[PDB]
Amino acid sequence: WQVILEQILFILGFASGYLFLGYPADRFGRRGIVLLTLGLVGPCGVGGAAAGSSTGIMALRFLLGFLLAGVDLGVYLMRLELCDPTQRLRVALAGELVGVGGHFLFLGLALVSKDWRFLQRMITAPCILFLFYGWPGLFLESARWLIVKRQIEEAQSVLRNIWKNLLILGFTNFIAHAIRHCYQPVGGGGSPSDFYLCSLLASGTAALACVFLGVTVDRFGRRGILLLSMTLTGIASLVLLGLWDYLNDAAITTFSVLGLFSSQASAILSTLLASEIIPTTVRGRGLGLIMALGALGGLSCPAQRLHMGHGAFLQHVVLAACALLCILSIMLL
């Protein structure tokens, strides 16, 4: 499918950006890279939406994904640096649903506009990745951090071991991404007709996935919830597959929507935990790599869940059994 090829190229662009723009991030700086990546995302995204040739379309889509990866990593670094450690957690949580907000707003626009005309060409349902349609302005709306840095610099001028936690968090971040798309018993999107019902659900499920992850991790600790946010999907994925002995089609939805809680809470939280282990220096080398594994792990739905479709439980059990490995290694932190 053309859309799935776009999504796979976009995920590969995210992987390449997250894996190759860390060294510039910690060498050149954490501010200039954001400006360069955003000022290239703009024209690159416009051209990708403009120049339609089916051969350069994927090239500019990959380039846009690479630049979006760079700007996302830079924005993450600036958020974790400028903000005070007392409330940095809330900023990071709000900085992880920014793409969720962009995608939900795009879908709401399409609904109120009633213009479902970019659909009806897609043979299969599109991948739900947020940043595919949550890039347009969500990151340029997150340019508020550039303003904050500008005012901080102006005020300043006026006044004038590690690898062990990287692999455990890398696998946890990778699994928490590649298992989110597996919580979809209705095909791999249930045709584009049901795409909005799943985009609203996934975005809406991410909203509550930041509530019990937003108000409890401070009291319970980031490691304690990460174990719970990885064992909740360790029960939400067996009864979904193994013990689904007449789940009456209603316990199939209370568990999948519960799976998207833990899967999207063990991916948001795992990104935060990588910051503490890595020092201020070379922070982007490893912290970007953790989501680089995660961004590369967004290949569940596009690469295999939609392409094969039939017998997709074999991927679900492999990833669900891999969650046991992540659970047994989370306590090792």
Tell me whether residue 41 or residue 320 sits nearer to Fe ion (CB atom): 41
- Asked if 112 interacts with a second copy (CB under 8 A), we say yes
Alpha helices in the chain (DSSP H): 2-20, 22-27, 32-50, 56-82, 88-94, 98-113, 131-134, 138-141, 144-159, 162-178, 195-208, 217-220, 222-231, 251-277, 283-296, 313-330
- Asked if 98 interacts with a second copy (CB under 8 A), we say yes
Q: Which of 14, 18, 106, 195 binds a second copy (CB under 8 A)?
A: 106
Least Cα distance to 291 among 278, 310, 304 occurs for: 278
Residue 282 in contact with residue 30, Cβ under 8 Å? no
DSSP secondary structure of 104-164: HHHHHHHHHHT---SSSS-SSPPP--SHHHH-TTHHHHTTHHHHHHHHHHHHHHHH--HHH
Q: From Fe ion, a second copy, none, which one binds at residue 239 (CB under 5 to 8 Å depending on kind)? A: none
Look up residue 304 and give its amino acid. Answer: Q
Q: How many chain residues touch a second copy (CB under 8 A)? A: 54
- Asked if 94 interacts with a second copy (CB under 8 A), we say yes
Region binding a second copy by CB under 8 A among candidate stretches 16-24, 41-49, 174-182, 187-195:
41-49
Q: Which of 154, 220, 241, 313 binds a second copy (CB under 8 A)?
A: 154
Exposure class string for 55-75: b at 16+ Cβ within 10 A, else e: eebbebbbbbbbbbbbbbbbb
Region binding Fe ion by CB under 5 A among candidate stretches 65-73, 85-93, 144-152, 156-164:
65-73
Residue 227 in contact with residue 263, Cβ under 8 Å? no
Tell me whether residue 26 or residue 72 sits nearer to Fe ion (CB atom): 72
- Asked if 129 interacts with a second copy (CB under 8 A), we say no
- Asked if 6 interacts with Fe ion (CB under 5 A), we say no
Minimum CB separation of residue 128 from a second copy in Å reads: 16
Cα 21 versus chain centre, distance? 17
Minimum CB separation of residue 223 from a second copy in Å reads: 23
Q: Which of 6, 8, 11, 72 binds Fe ion (CB under 5 A)?
A: 72
Minimum CB separation of residue 208 from a second copy in Å reads: 13
Q: Which of 1, 5, 108, 253 binds a second copy (CB under 8 A)?
A: 108
- Asked if 80 interacts with Fe ion (CB under 5 A), we say no
Least Cα distance to 13 among 37, 49, 32, 31 occurs for: 37
Binding site for Fe ion (CB under 5 A): 72
The residues binding a second copy (CB under 8 A) are 35, 38-43, 45-47, 49-50, 52, 83, 87, 90-91, 93-95, 97-98, 101-102, 105-106, 108-110, 112-115, 117-118, 121, 133, 135-144, 146-148, 150-151, 154-155
